[PDB]
Design a protein around this ligand. Structure first.
Ligand code: LNS
Ligand code: ZN
Ligand code: ZN
Ligand code: ZN
Length: 459
């Protein structure tokens, strides 16, 4: 049990308005055949065009919602809609394109998928709410066969060209006309009552229904993300490294240690309340403070209510000292807080569109994150950049230009001239900090936080 058996039954009720007379008894084997594809009893890495929910979850970066609406069946034009927001009109002869024949439509499909997916995944997973026309339109832009590699590199092939008779991955497919060996999943097989809109609108108010194919494609992928990452959470699935994952994770650990250490030095809190990941470790192990932990897993649906986290009877006095919320998404932070909160609006290869304003942040594990909300930070202010260090000024062991900065809080800068070691550490810290901010993380702190209070820690 690794792939979806072609002999698995497929419920055809959702298909019978577009395909009247469709047999109630149907397998994937007969469905693929009805779509105009032949699998030839082939043991060459592609056992089924359709995949299991578990396989779809492992390949969430490949998800592309896809819907087809009858504009007017080989006689009428079709509107092809994708969760990228694109609508193409194919004639049989929110971006909306005029009607064109399939030979040109297929070139646009290959360009769109390659640009969307080259940095996300080695494949495409079409996420459907299958009614019939989308399945029968696939033969006009999809080719299947044995698993192949790119003609220009070692990656698996995702495109085919009829002009050159060659195969390419998403990076090398310019000029290619067929999508090759795509995967697909029909959400309608998961057991739902009622249509797409009624199921999507139960959990999301951010996507409307203009009645165009791309709106349905967006809602379909949204419902699939809600089912697989919001109401169901699996932090055991590992995802490949596709970008700056390791650097971002190291940067987050560096910034956390820096900020918490400086807040403890500047305001001398007797107690710190660490609210979040039940597996968290003291980020400033040498600090004098009474460190108290409170367990809260990442919220994937709505942000936690501070009344539930803190009230219903612990130190009990969360008002004493400082609260540390490092990626613990709450509705309204207390005024005595140090906060790291992921901004779901950020554009990156790690952050995928999510459900109800939220986003799916995929970095080693998949984390659906509730929508970023500026009102959560009304009791706090943005944490300004600063570098602090009490380590001795000594080079040990990279070219140099003297550093001049009001934000390098060191003994050497206090004395009037930043030493080489602290200039190197400052530049490294600034790089880690900028990496973390650009990845989507935002930092917030209690209003009394003032770096001017750090200078007297050098006496
Ligand atoms: C096996 N390859 C992958 O899982 C993958 C994922 C994202 C990007 C790329 C690439 O750009 O090659 N590859
Ligand atoms: Zn390639
Ligand atoms: Zn939605
Ligand atoms: Zn120094």
């Amino acid at each position: 049990p690794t792939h979806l058996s072609v002999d698995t039954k497929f419920k055809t009720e959702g298909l019978c308005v577009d395909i009247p007379g469709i047999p109630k008894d149907m397998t994937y084997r007969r469905l693929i055949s009805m779509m105009g594809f032949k699998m030839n009893y082939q043991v060459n890495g592609y056992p089924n065009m359709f995949i299991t929910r578990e396989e779809a979850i492992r390949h969430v970066r490949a998800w592309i919602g896809f819907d087809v609406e009858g504009c007017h069946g080989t006689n009428l034009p079709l509107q092809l809609g994708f969760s990228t927001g694109v609508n193409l009109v194919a004639v049989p002869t929110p971006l909306m394109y005029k009607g064109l024949p399939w030979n040109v439509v297929r070139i646009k499909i290959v360009q769109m998928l390659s640009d969307t997916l080259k940095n996300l995944s080695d494949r495409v997973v079409f996420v459907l709410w299958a009614h019939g026309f989308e399945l029968t339109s696939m033969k006009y832009f999809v080719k299947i066969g044995p698993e192949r590699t790119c003609c220009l590199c070692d990656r698996r092939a995702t495109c085919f060209s009829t002009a050159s008779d060659t195969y390419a991955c998403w990076h090398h497919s310019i000029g290619f006309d067929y999508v090759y060996n795509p995967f697909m999943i029909d959400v309608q097989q998961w057991g739902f009552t009622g249509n797409l809109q009624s199921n999507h609108d139960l959990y999301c108010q951010v996507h409307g229904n203009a009645h165009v194919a791309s709106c349905d494609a967006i809602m379909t992928r949204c419902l699939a993300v809600h089912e697989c990452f919001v109401k169901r959470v699996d932090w055991t699935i590992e995802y490949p490294i596709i970008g700056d994952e390791l650097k971002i994770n190291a940067a987050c650990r560096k910034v956390q240690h820096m900020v918490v250490k400086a807040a403890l030095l500047a305001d001398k809190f007797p107690v710190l309340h660490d609210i979040g990941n039940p597996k968290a470790i003291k980020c400033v192990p040498q600090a004098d403070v009474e460190w108290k932990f409170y367990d809260a897993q990442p919220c994937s649906d709505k942000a936690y209510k501070i009344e539930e986290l803190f009230y219903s009877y612990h130190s009990d006095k969360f008002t004493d000292g400082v609260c540390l919320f490092w990626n613990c998404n709450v509705d309204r932070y207390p005024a005595n807080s140090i906060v790291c909160r992921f901004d779901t609006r950020v554009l990156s290869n790690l952050n995928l569109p999510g459900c109800d304003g939220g986003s799916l942040y995929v970095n080693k594990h998949a984390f659906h994150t509730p929508a970023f909300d500026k009102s959560a930070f009304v009791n706090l202010k943005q944490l300004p950049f600063f570098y602090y260090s009490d380590s001795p000024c000594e080079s040990h062991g990279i070219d140099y230009v003297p550093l001049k900065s009001a934000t390098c809080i060191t003994r050497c800068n206090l004395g009037g001239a930043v030493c080489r070691h602290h200039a190197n550490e400052y530049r490294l810290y600034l790089d880690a900090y900028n990496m973390m901010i650009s990845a989507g993380f935002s930092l917030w702190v209690y209003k009394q936080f003032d770096t001017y209070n750090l200078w007297n820690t050098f006496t």
